[PDB]
Amino acid sequence: HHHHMYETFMKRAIELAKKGLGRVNPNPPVGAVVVKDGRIIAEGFHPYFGGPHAERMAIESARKKGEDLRGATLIVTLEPCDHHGKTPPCTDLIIESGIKTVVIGTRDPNPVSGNGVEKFRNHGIEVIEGVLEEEVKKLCEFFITYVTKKRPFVALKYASTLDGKIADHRGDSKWITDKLRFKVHEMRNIYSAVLVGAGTVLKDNPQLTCRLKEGRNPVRVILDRKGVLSGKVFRVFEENARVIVFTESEEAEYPPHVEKALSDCSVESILRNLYERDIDSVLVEGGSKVFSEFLDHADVVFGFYSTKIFGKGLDVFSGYLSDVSVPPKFKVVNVEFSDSEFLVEMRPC
Amino acid sequence: HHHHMYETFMKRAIELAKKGLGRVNPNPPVGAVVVKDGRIIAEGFHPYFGGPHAERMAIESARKKGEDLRGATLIVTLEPCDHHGKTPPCTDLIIESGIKTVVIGTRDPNPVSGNGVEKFRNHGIEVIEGVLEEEVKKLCEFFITYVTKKRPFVALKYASTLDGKIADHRGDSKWITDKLRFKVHEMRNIYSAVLVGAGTVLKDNPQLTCRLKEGRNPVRVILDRKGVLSGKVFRVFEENARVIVFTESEEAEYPPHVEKALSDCSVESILRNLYERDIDSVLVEGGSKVFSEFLDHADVVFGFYSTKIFGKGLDVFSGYLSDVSVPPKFKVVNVEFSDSEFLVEMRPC
Ligand SMILES: NC(=O)C1=CN([C@@H]2O[C@H](COP(=O)(O)OP(=O)(O)OC[C@H]3O[C@@H](n4cnc5c(N)ncnc54)[C@H](OP(=O)(O)O)[C@@H]3O)[C@@H](O)[C@H]2O)C=CC1
Ligand SMILES: NC(=O)C1=CN([C@@H]2O[C@H](COP(=O)(O)OP(=O)(O)OC[C@H]3O[C@@H](n4cnc5c(N)ncnc54)[C@H](OP(=O)(O)O)[C@@H]3O)[C@@H](O)[C@H]2O)C=CC1
Ligand SMILES: [Cl-]
Numbered sequence A, B: 001h002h003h004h005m006y007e008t009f010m011k012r013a014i015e016l017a018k019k020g021l022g023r024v025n026p027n028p029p030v031g032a033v034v035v036k037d038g039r040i041i042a043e044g045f046h047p048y049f050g051g052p053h054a055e056r057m058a059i060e061s062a063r064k065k066g067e068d069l070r071g072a073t074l075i076v077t078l079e080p081c082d083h084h085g086k087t088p089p090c091t092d093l094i095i096e097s098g099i100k101t102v103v104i105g106t107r108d109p110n111p112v113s114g115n116g117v118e119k120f121r122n123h124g125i126e127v128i129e130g131v132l133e134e135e136v137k138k139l140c141e142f143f144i145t146y147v148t149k150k151r152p153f154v155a156l157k158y159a160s161t162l163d164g165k166i167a168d169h170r171g172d173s174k175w176i177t178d179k180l181r182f183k184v185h186e187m188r189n190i191y192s193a194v195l196v197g198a199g200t201v202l203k204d205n206p207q208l209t210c211r212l213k214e215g216r217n218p219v220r221v222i223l224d225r226k227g228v229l230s231g232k233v234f235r236v237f238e239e240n241a242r243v244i245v246f247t248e249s250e251e252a253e254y255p256p257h258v259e260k261a262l263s264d265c266s267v268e269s270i271l272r273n274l275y276e277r278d279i280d281s282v283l284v285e286g287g288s289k290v291f292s293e294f295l296d297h298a299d300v301v302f303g304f305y306s307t308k309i310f311g312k313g314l315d316v317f318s319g320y321l322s323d324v325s326v327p328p329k330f331k332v333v334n335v336e337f338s339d340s341e342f343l344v345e346m347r348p349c
């Protein structure tokens, strides 16, 4: 009865949370709904990094509407904070509002958030934990990775022909993804950073922007170990996003608004460096050498395919080598298709 | 009302028809159900090439049960024949049984079957045409192709890594397909012939048998233009199936139960030759040169993928060449996945 209703309400809370994806990072996305006598009476989401917490938005909304919250229920994706930020903690707000039941998707893995569940139970409140927990952990996987592993979540996205080519015999890559391009721009609108190698910049001179007009551009991370992009203004160096170039070249020079990060350039150093720049997620977009280096480090792989067939061309993972005896390292968790294209989502075993 | 019931009954007729797939070829698979006062009272399917027609099986079954067929309805996938074979035509049987309504999925494209629909309507019977017609044409696509295009239906099936490799750097292909192997054996149990090149025979020495114990082995078609398989007993030459080797070598010699077909070896000549040997369907299974040659001739392509990644290896279509400017020639009509594997069905645009 209630548990099915709690799942229905948690579904809406997740939908609410998603409104902040790409803006809250590296905070988690959070959604909150306040229910009274079975009706949602207010809603809230975390809108941007350092903005109001979802619970506060929802509770203040309710009060503005003249709702009496005494005896109401809060359904919230993440355990409410129990630390004084700029404001008192959400725990105190919830307690003082008269809310009697708090339903949580997952506990906050960040130690500094404190013991919200315990505080609530110490003030007579019913705390129900784990409603749609798996869905909520997926929702917050960037944050969970950032907090628990101290690195960004890594996705690897490629566009390939049926025969595993990311470019034809001339090195041309245009026009492989078409009807599934919207998925890429969705990803660019959510991932904090997108990452490409210098061979891609030299060959394709890509924008790497989110093409949704009202979206936001992700941070561009350019891997240029040897400094071959020095002294030129490629489209990835346009001043429409934060831009970081990792290189081992002291000589290399990039435009003044681009951060040059002189580095040993190991995947490990790159990921630590990004963590230290508050980047909770990176979308590795190529090319072949980059794919090859990051493949063992990906938390998710998105293979965008086309029914095109090139015959000869640049292989997706041309720098990798394995053989038939090595078992697969990924499982398929989802496939989508449209017209001449399909998208496979894979996750590490 | 009735039309929904006709679709329900036609669904069962299709399910019945499928019991003959792989055995009826090059006849079509056909299913029949007899319904009286809303109940299925008898069923029938075409069991093997030159066997009883589905309608006859169903009508004789009903009579054996003591059912009075006067005023009953027949639902049958394919338009009943109006030619005297060994037996009188199904049209006469149906008329004489007292059946008043005949519901057909699709008309028979074979001219020799005659004008069943018209005969029925001339003997007062209600003929309803086109129920689940698209599904039935899919069911009979081998036969429809055979009759209307005078060639076998061609499917191309490959097993590839994510990066488009059908073999690793050592030429090893073992263990790519695992959890989807059952789909391959299903196909081998239904397609009249399976086809491979000599490079595959030399490298893999495959059985190319249907591994379902109670299935049946398809005809093996081996493409050996140069006669490199001469004088050796590969597993494809075991006497557990009909075997045809196409070659331009007069010198080549194969075991006595193998048919040597001396040919110019064009895809066109091969397909005509197979048509002339009453083969209504061929499953092209590799390798790379063969895939490359047949790709433009495939009616359907089945890409079996694994999340394995080889890095370097033998490309699926290593003999083909295209580029980014060529539009895709296939649409995705279905995707299935399990564990570390996925299957994409593609059809020509
Ligand atoms: N269809 C698709 O999904 C896409 C296709 N493409 C195609 O791929 C091709 C480009 O691929 P490719 O040529 O392999 O080039 P990459 O884009 O993989 O760039 C390789 C360059 O990046 C540097 N690099 C690689 N890893 C690092 C790192 N860890 N830190 C710093 N620098 C690093 C390399 O340094 P070093 O020389 O020392 O190794 C090299 O200079 C183009 O043809 C493009 O059209 C590109 C992206 C996606
Ligand atoms: N993972 C998978 O789906 C599979 C992988 N494999 C792998 O593929 C490899 C074999 O591929 P590949 O080497 O390209 O060899 P193929 O199996 O494609 O065989 C090529 C041979 O067949 C002959 N041939 C090709 N077309 C015709 C034709 N129209 N008529 C008569 N003869 C023809 C060729 O003649 P000519 O020399 O004159 O061109 C050549 O001798 C092996 O490594 C095997 O392990 C094989 C099958 C499937
Ligand atoms: Cl771009």
Ligand SMILES: [Cl-]
Pocket (backbone or CB within 6 Å): B206, B207, B208, B209
């Ligand atoms: Cl086999």
Ligand SMILES: [Zn+2]
Pocket (backbone or CB within 6 Å): A053, A055, A080, A081, A082, A089, A090, A091
């Ligand atoms: Zn809070």
Ligand SMILES: [Zn+2]
Pocket (backbone or CB within 6 Å): B053, B055, B080, B081, B082, B089, B090, B091
């Ligand atoms: Zn008949």
